[PDB]
């Protein structure tokens, strides 16, 4: 004979001894959001990972403006950036930033960095936006810190309206133009 | 007949052919910390997510002080903030900050942002604390960056002492009061 | 009789009714990257967590230089730092920083903080590096914010070359030496 009860746990696994009497069915195992069940003949492997993630390198040779105009923030067009790494189809680069797909509402860990050695004065202004809410931070320059960083953990509500479900990005120096810059933008959905 | 051996893997799944001889039991499948096993009749679905997370919007209309006093940091009372999103019961808002429950020791990804357009001068002082350790960062203002941000990935040891197992929060401008501000505080336990 | 079909899902679980005819084998369940299948007799528990993580406290009594020289960044030797918390063997402290092991390429959530109360002037310069890419940020001081923070979410490509697969760290004040400092460095691989 077969089957056992436990208390905690679920699906019995081989439940469904009922719906086709005389027949013990034994349910299969699927991996939902953030999981992978790989079928190695010997046993099924439950592996975890994030649903979506996109990491871009943005320079004047990977979709960037020849010169980031001094003291001013114009949202970046990242349709041409360079995809260093990505996971899933939830996060995609577009001309307005990184677009989030339908049903992708959740928490996102975002980081945008910059490095433009030739400009070590003034402050580096950074800005990530999403919907009505926009996040900022100014980073004082110097030859030792000729750049800036803005990391964020935010909740993104995805309406399902393609042009509002987008993370827009932007940065610059308040007293000089950037045309020798290396930018990095990484977005990851953790839940 | 039934059952097979594998090498790697575990529980045999239908192990426990021993403890009730003549009876093949076949163990069930439970989802521990950060997992969800949903019972779709056809098969059990293993889904992943974080254990706990809390995301607050904090303004002068969601539990905030009518005016954040200039140059000075007084821990925020977030009992009245607004819960934009939350996951689990581990992270709860209180009058001293975000409280962590018993047995919730682990790594936390924290982000507190501010935006107060009407004040574009001086620096924005931000501060997150936990126990003896406190983390800070000053953010130079400007009309383009009229705010500040502080993101953190820290290890929180939860003693189980309700008044010490709390993330306290605080920010301000070093040269003006904030009374037209929008604050956001998100905490997430990733392990 | 036994077994059932589902559509979605996998491994049938008790598949392999073929490879040893007349014998229903019933595969086992293993936990891959970021998962733990614990064998409680009653049922197997699928638990999730991160693969690797390391959290260090760095002071002049846990492998640190008696004095962090003013205005200048020298990569920190963290072989002697203090391991507040760690998860897995992927992230290990060394004399050049935190080393990543073979096959550990992936996204990393990094945070380095500093606090040196006795020095409240000038800016705190912070710097995390990895390969050719280096990330920076300057944090204006003050008695209220006598420190700095740099949080990052980056993609680390691990070549498998032990001396290049290392996160180097470094910080200081641009106008004074730090010899009463408390530093914290936490690295976590989330995918």
UniProtKB/Swiss-Prot annotation, chains A, B, C:
Source superkingdom: Viruses
Region annotation Domain-2: where it falls in the sequence: 1-191
Locations listed in the record: Virion
Keywords carried by this UniProt record: Capsid protein, Virion
Primary localisation category: virion
A GO CC term assigned to this protein in UniProt: icosahedral viral capsid, spike
Keyword Flavoprotein: no
Entry remark concerning the domains of this protein: The short collagen-like region is proposed to act as a trimerization signal leading to the fulfillment of the symmetry requirement of the minor capsomer.
Job of this protein: In association with P31 and P2, forms the spike complexes located at the 5-fold vertices of the capsid. Essential for viral infectivity.
Subunit structure: Homotrimer.
Protein's name in the database: Spike protein P5
Source organism: Enterobacteria phage PRD1 (Bacteriophage PRD1)
Species lineage: Viruses, Varidnaviria, Bamfordvirae, Preplasmiviricota, Tectiliviricetes
Gene: V
Full-protein positions shown: 142 to 340 of 340
């Amino acid at each position: 004979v077969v089957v056992e009860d436990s208390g905690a746990s679920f699906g019995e696994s081989l439940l469904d001894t009922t719906s086709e009497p005389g027949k013990i069915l034994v349910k299969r195992i699927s991996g939902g959001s953030g999981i992978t069940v790989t079928d190695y003949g010997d046993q099924v492997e439950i592996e975890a990972s994030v649903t979506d993630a996109l990491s871009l390198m943005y320079s004047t040779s990977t979709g960037g403006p020849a010169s980031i105009a001094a003291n001013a923030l114009t949202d970046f067009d990242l349709s041409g950036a360079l995809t260093v790494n990505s996971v899933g189809t939830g996060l995609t680069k577009s001309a307005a930033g990184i677009q989030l797909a339908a049903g992708k509402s959740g928490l996102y860990q975002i980081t945008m960095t910059v490095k433009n050695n030739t400009v070590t004065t003034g402050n580096y202004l950074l800005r990530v936006k999403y919907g009505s809410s926009d996040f900022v931070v100014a980073c004082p320059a110097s030859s030792l810190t000729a750049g800036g960083t803005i990391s964020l953990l935010i909740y993104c509500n995805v309406l399902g309206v393609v042009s509002l479900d987008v993370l827009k990005f932007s940065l610059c120096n308040d007293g000089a133009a950037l045309s020798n810059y290396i930018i990095n933008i990484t977005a990851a959905k953790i839940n």
